[PDB]
Amino acid sequence: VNIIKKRTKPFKRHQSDRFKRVGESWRKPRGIDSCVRRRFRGTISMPKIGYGNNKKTRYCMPNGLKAFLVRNVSDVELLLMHNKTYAAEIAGNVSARKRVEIVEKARALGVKVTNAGAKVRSQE
Amino acid sequence: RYVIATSAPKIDVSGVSVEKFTKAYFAKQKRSGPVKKDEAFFAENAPKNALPAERIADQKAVDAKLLPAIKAIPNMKEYLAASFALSNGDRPHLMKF
Amino acid sequence: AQGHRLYVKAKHLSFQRSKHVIHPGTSIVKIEGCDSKEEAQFYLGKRVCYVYKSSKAVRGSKIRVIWGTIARPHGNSGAVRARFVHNLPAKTFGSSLRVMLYPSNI
Amino acid sequence: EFQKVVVIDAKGHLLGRLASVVAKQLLGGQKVVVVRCEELNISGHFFRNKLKYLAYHFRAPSRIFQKAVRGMLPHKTARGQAALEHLQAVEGIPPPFDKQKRVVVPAALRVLRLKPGRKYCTVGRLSSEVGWKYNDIVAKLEERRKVKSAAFYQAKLAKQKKIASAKEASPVNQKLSQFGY
Amino acid sequence: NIPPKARKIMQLLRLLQINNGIFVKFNKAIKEMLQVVEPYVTYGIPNHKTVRELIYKRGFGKVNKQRIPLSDNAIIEAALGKYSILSVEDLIHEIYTVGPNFKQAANFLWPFKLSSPLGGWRERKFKHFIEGGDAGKRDEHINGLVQKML
Amino acid sequence: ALKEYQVVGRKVPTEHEPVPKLFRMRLFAPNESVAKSRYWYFLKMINKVKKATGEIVAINEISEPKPLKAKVFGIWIRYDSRSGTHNMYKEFRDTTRVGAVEAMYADMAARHRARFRSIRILKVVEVEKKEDVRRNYVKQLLNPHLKFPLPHRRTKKVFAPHRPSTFY
RNA sequence: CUCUGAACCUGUGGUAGGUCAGCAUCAGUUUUCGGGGGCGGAAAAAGAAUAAGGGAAGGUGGCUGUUUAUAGCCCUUGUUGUAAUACGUCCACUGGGGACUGAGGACUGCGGCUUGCCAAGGAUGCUGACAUAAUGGU
RNA sequence: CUGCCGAAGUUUCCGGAUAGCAGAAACUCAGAUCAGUUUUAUGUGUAAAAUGAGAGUUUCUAGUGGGCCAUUUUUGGUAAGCAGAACUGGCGAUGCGGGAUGAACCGAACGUGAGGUUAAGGUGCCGGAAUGUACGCUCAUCAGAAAGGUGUUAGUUCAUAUGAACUAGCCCUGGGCGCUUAAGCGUACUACCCAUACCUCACCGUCUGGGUUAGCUUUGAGAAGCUCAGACGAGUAGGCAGGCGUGGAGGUUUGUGACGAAGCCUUGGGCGUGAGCCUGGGUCGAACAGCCUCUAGUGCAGAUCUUGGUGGAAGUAGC
RNA sequence: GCGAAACCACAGCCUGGGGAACGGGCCAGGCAA
RNA sequence: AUGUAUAAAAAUAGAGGUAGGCUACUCUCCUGUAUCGUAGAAGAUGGGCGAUGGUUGAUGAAACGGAAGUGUUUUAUUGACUUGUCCAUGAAAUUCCAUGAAUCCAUUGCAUACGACUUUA
């Protein structure tokens, strides 16, 4: 059970490159005569349930860990017993003060922190 | 797999003691010999794994048991000396090695 | 400089393709001296390589090699199908590929 | 066997068959130089090919042979554009290539492809009355080069005879003749 | 573009897919039956090897309406124990010799999903076999065909 | 890969016809199944016997009794053209009766664009007497003065260095 | 008295975390060369071998005509024989080459070898190099 | 945003009520009935064997309620074509390989992938694959892919080695480059090329059939869980289901925030089939969010859409 | 020196065939600087 | 890049060579899988022997080569090398694959949509 994906590239919206009012978020083309919706050659792909990844590998980072979002230092403690499968993602608005409290606690706990070097700076 | 089996006339190799040649004899030296955590800095601990004499003395014995064997076959000693190569229009399948 | 060349020269023809659809995963290679499907059996399994140079000096050298492996013959004229670790660029059509003699089965 | 530079003699060769083998070779990243293109041959008698040109404007067979290949290669594709420059078609045998070997293509040889008694046309003869006006000078160079080449061949033949006599006189030759050498 | 009459006949034979294959008890009704589907099927007399090889390599049971492979003798006897069929040899014998329980034995084997033949068909395929194609009757020539799809 | 198959067949016996007559003929078919189907079509044309009305009793292939001795074969054939009614008779010199038959089929398929269904083999015979031979070409092949150079010599190893000698 | 693999000296004791290539023994799916055999076909047909006869030839010798000669052939038997080859078919006969896959995660089951062991209810070993760049992504 | 099912495209009476197709529910049965089925046989129909599939009802409710093409069938035709009714399929709701290209022709009907092999069609080059083998025919001075011919090719038949009359093929006259005992045609047999097709496996989902508690140190009871097996996957109108996102509302995270909220840009890194999400850096400076429910002025590419901004036109018309 | 409005999916060599226009995009072509 | 190696013409349905005095000869072809070159720590150290030749580098130019001659030889000498026949050491634990004129300018009319053009300067 290794982290293997059925596709890397994202699904862009059709004609989203030409226009700027058209967003790159995938929108299903409902055009009645839309040949790109009709799956012609030289067109783009389209999301299907056939593109799902392994259910024992869904949500898994390329190193095998599933990201887990820890707000405060209480959250980093409950990953005590899943440190081999989950990685303590630090929320984006957590201040540099509690950010060190989260990383030092998680280092001793044995869990892996994904963004442990943000807004902080080491000193020897 | 990385050796081409040549049909050259076979050389007696029964004389040399082949039993001492094992996996342990050819094993790569274990990643060992810890150093105190001051000599790693300043790079003042570097040893050299220079080939031990008995390894040569093993081979010199092997030479002493194969060099006499090979000169008897004419042109064999020079044949090993020469370096294998391909000229133009060389088809390995056609010309058996 | 007579010597060296423990390999056999070969030319990279194109990709495996229909009339209009190309699959670049596997490429056609025409090895010198190979002119029949029965003859190409000898070269099945060999290690083919693409050797090219570039301006950047990486590891102190200037050579980048994309390894590969011959898989099956391709037609009656001695062509073979070779899969590489990285699919060859479409610009290298009609170049030189070096078919070294290992893994040897002889 | 393939070389970086290949010289192909066009005398006694079919145009289309010669065009095919060079078209594949050119796509193979190989430089091919064609000499004596004026002596190419096309199946069908002289009048038919004359009518073909009348319906069809480059008078040089070197250009005509290049033109035939040009439509026989992916000219639109930039790969085909690059491969075009690797082909050099010249009339006669120029000095840069006269002192080099001239190989032939079996698949294009008239004697191996044309039934006896079948009419054929020569491009140089065909081009003589369509705008080409250099047959005499081109021919004049041909005998001049072949006369010099024939003298070279005689010297080479004499050298070959001398070394052949020396080779036979060598006792080493028959010492190990069991190898077929 | 299969004719509606032909499709009804060939769904009756459980040949729902191209390059499928089922065993058929030859009788008087069969000849005039597959006259409609002659340009759409081929058939012939299979020898014991072809009967044996198809059931071994590609013989899947129909257990609780599931395509269950026959890789152990317990499967056949659990379904065909009532007909004294207890192992693969008996299944071959119930098929090859066409025993009393041929109807039940035939239904038990899922239609063999064969492959595209090694070496392909003839240059043209959708003509009668006697006319150079590969459709219709071919008698003892079926065995050469199954050994290309096995 | 034609091969001469003998076919014997008879109609299904019944209370009206307890003993059917035995009908046997030699036809050239690439396999047994083609031979049987052709035999039924021939019987329908001549005796009007359906496949169900009858049944084949024996099929057997015939090898050349003397395949190593050259012979001359004459075949009578009826061929279907734009009019749908034509008859021809040809002679060939070959060492195998099948070899003669496949030779004629190629000639028919070339000169007249003849199909296997259209062609029906009427008569097969062996030509032995010199005076029996009629065609000019085989007559030229009969006199003991047969001597001529090999025609169509023309003899991937591309880019041969030397000019081919193409002589003796 | 135990314990804290507790701190240090003492060990230079023993095992060594990811990425990528290499070979090996296996398994599934295959593609491709082989070898050895069984049965069947006019029990191939032939052929050679093989004692004759007859015949004619595009006729050897004799002389276009001619009949084995100073070439012989063909046909017919005879002919060894159960010849061999080929073709068709089978082997629960066997020996190699190459590619793509490793899904599952104690134990069962079904088999074989002889409790144990195994190619039998899906891949494990030996190694290396890179890592302190390779493999990677944009 | 994704997932499943998915027509009808029209009978019939008469703008409609029917029907039919598709569903949704309720029923009774597989030891019962069936079939755009095939036989047997009695007189093409009818009745009674095989091959398969479980089959039949009742209720209520969306959409359709056109055609085109092709096949055929005929009737007449009518200059001649053709027209007129039908007949049955295909497209229409359907992509892919081939046909130079081309909606109607030849193949094959679609989850994401790896290998294998093929169909139709092809192997001179463009072009993936034999400038394969065997045999003929084609000479065109427009090839090729009604007839005439001091036009040939093979000839046949009849006359006495020659002619005449004929038999037939082909030529002449009336996709590109090239190809010419072909790279043309025709037949045959080998080998090879490749599709969203066929096989084997992986994976996603759907449906169907299971298994599972005195919860047994296999620990796998979010029983709404875990686990096992098999087949399957086009889609308009339309039906069903699960989700993502915005503003605010009660509960909650003893949540985040001047050690930097929200926002914004960025070829930073990730996650999800996707809607979307999490995070690094730069700006930034005072608020904000995850979860369970409540709620609605809630999701944009169009509307010659409203408002504001901004270009080309253009330093143009010109003044 | 002072300075618009109209218009604007996007473009712009043809040759032919491409069946439904197809040329303004497709395939064969040449051109293409 | 990896030997970055190779020159007759011409028939091909007869050519070529070989030899004799165009006339009588003969021989080879039937390809290149040919031929040349290819031996050494990339090819070591020396000892020789043996050629006493060969292989070449370096320069000193001689002729040939018009076409696109730019290369073919001839060498003159020198420098090395020489596995031609041989020896003795030596080469490695990386101890399994990855490697100064001219233009504008002035002149200028020989010009003249405007440049250009036109001499002079």
Side-chain angles (χ1 to χ4, degrees), chain B residues 55-71:
Chain B
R55 274 271 300 100
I56 301 298
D58 183 350
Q59 173 74 11
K60 299 290 98 184
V62 175
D63 254 3
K65 302 165 184 304
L66 281 285
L67 206 57
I70 48 139
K71 69 233 182 285

Side-chain angles (χ1 to χ4, degrees), chain F residues 105-120:
Chain F
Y105 265 96
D107 159 9
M108 291 315 78
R111 296 199 219 269
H112 309 281
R113 193 200 145 90
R115 314 276 112 203
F116 198 12
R117 315 168 181 96
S118 38
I119 295 140
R120 52 265 199 193

Side-chain angles (χ1 to χ4, degrees), chain E residues 1 4-5 7-9 11-14 17-20 22 27-29 32-33 58 60 62 64-69 103 106-107 110 113-126:
Chain E
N1 306 331
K5 180 185 281 285
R7 212 180 278 106
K8 185 49 192 159
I9 276 166
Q11 287 218 63
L12 225 52
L13 265 58
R14 306 181 302 154
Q17 188 166 184
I18 167 172
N19 288 354
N20 264 34
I22 81 162
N27 75 78
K28 65 206 175 48
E32 49 256 19
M33 191 295 268
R58 307 219 178 234
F60 295 1
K62 182 172 207 159
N64 262 338
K65 313 166 181 173
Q66 292 204 358
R67 192 168 168 255
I68 291 289
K103 168 184 190 172
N107 286 46
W110 209 273
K113 285 145 58 70
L114 315 181
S115 184
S116 281
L118 261 173
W121 312 73
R122 296 184 194 281
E123 53 260 15
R124 187 77 56 76
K125 179 192 146 194
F126 293 114

Side-chain angles (χ1 to χ4, degrees), chain F residues 23-39:
Chain F
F23 312 101
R24 164 192 166 281
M25 103 165 88
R26 285 157 45 134
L27 56 144
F28 299 80
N31 56 75
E32 282 189 358
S33 306
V34 173
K36 296 147 74 162
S37 174
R38 286 181 59 186
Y39 169 86

Side-chain angles (χ1 to χ4, degrees), chain E residues 8-54:
Chain E
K8 185 49 192 159
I9 276 166
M10 253 172 37
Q11 287 218 63
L12 225 52
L13 265 58
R14 306 181 302 154
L15 287 177
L16 320 95
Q17 188 166 184
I18 167 172
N19 288 354
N20 264 34
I22 81 162
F23 287 114
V24 164
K25 185 171 186 165
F26 204 43
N27 75 78
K28 65 206 175 48
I30 278 298
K31 310 172 210 191
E32 49 256 19
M33 191 295 268
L34 46 78
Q35 280 333 279
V36 202
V37 299
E38 198 78 15
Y40 308 146
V41 309
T42 177
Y43 54 52
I45 319 166
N47 45 23
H48 176 95
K49 167 178 175 76
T50 282
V51 179
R52 167 176 178 278
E53 213 153 10
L54 279 166

Side-chain angles (χ1 to χ4, degrees), chain F residues 44-112:
Chain F
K44 174 57 61 196
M45 181 145 48
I46 309 307
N47 263 321
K48 279 83 61 180
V49 171
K50 290 93 179 168
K51 297 149 181 46
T53 309
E55 52 93 19
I56 322 288
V57 290
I59 298 84
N60 237 27
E61 63 171 350
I62 300 71
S63 295
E64 200 82 23
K66 284 284 195 170
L68 230 44
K69 185 183 64 182
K71 288 161 292 190
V72 181
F73 296 78
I75 313 295
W76 278 261
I77 318 85
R78 283 265 299 151
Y79 155 77
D80 261 26
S81 197
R82 308 185 184 184
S83 62
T85 292
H86 266 101
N87 183 45
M88 281 135 278
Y89 149 71
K90 275 291 300 300
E91 297 164 354
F92 309 92
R93 174 156 169 77
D94 248 4
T95 77
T96 282
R97 194 176 255 89
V98 158
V101 160
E102 59 203 5
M104 161 275 308
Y105 265 96
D107 159 9
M108 291 315 78
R111 296 199 219 269
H112 309 281

Side-chain angles (χ1 to χ4, degrees), chain C residues 32-52:
Chain C
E32 277 315 306
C34 206
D35 277 330
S36 75
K37 44 173 195 288
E38 71 76 20
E39 163 52 51
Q41 297 301 315
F42 180 85
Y43 294 110
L44 253 61
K46 307 285 114 167
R47 287 263 298 170
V48 74
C49 64
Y50 178 63
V51 164
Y52 60 106

